[PDB]
Amino acid sequence: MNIFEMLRIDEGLRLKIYKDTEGYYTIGIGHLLTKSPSLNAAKSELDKAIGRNCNGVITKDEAEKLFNQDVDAAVRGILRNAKLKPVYDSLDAVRRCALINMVFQMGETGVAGFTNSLRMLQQKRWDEAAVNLAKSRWYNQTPNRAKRVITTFRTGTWDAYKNL
């Protein structure tokens, strides 16, 4: 298991534009196109992203290219963020993947707002961090995913991703 396999489990793979859990136009492996309610706006973003006229459909190769770019951008983002970077640097490789997963799902700003959880993670208070992380809109709106990510942060194992 690794970050790519982990996010592939959490995000799925769809080759036509769809709406994510928040109602937003998305394609591939959780690649958010736009928060606009205009399908035409989403299609324009997709064409720009892929570099051709797609008409809302991409190949598996194209979806994986976007995915690679998106994972790379999440990591670079963490490393450029004054609040996230120290947390990331403090963690082992398995828990670092938890952090990338959260950033991939909700963005840097949103994760950086988990101030109290981030402090508990940096202190390596794993059970307490896990309890605090669940007191969140994130957990209530995507509880199965949040439970897997939280278990990863709590155990520093991939146990939550191995029946899948």
Give catalytic residues, as residue numbers.
Answer: 11, 20
- 55 annotated among ligand-binding-site residues: no
**Spatial distance between the Cα atoms of 11 and 145, rounded to a whole number of angstroms:** 9
49 binds Cl ion (CB under 5 A): yes
Structure tokens that stand for 29 in this block: 């492996």
- State the minimum distance, in angstroms, from the CB of residue 145 to Cl ion: 4
Per CB under 5 A, which region of 81-89, 115-123, 128-136, 137-145 contacts Cl ion? 137-145
Q: List the one residue from 55, 109, 144, 157 that touches Cl ion (CB under 5 A).
A: 144
> Least distance to Cl ion from the beta carbon of 58, Å?
12
- CA 126 to CA 134: how far, in whole Å? 13
Out of 101, 117, 132, 142, point to the residue binding Cl ion (CB under 5 A): 142
Size of interface with Cl ion, in residues (CB under 5 A): 6
Task: Pick the piece of the chain touching Cl ion (CB under 5 A) from 33-41, 92-100, 145-153, 156-164.
Answer: 145-153
**Two structure tokens written together for 45:** 């973003």
3-state helix, strand, coil in the chain (%, to 5): 65, 10, 25
Is 117 part of any known ligand binding site? Answer: yes
DSSP character string of 123-146: TT-HHHHHHHHTSSHHHHHSHHHH
Q: Which is nearer to Cl ion, 104 or 153 (CB)?
A: 104
Please indicate if the annotation marks 38 as binding a ligand.
no
> Nearest Cα to 83, choosing from 59, 104, 109, 105?
109
Q: Is 43 in the site for Cl ion (CB under 5 A)?
A: no
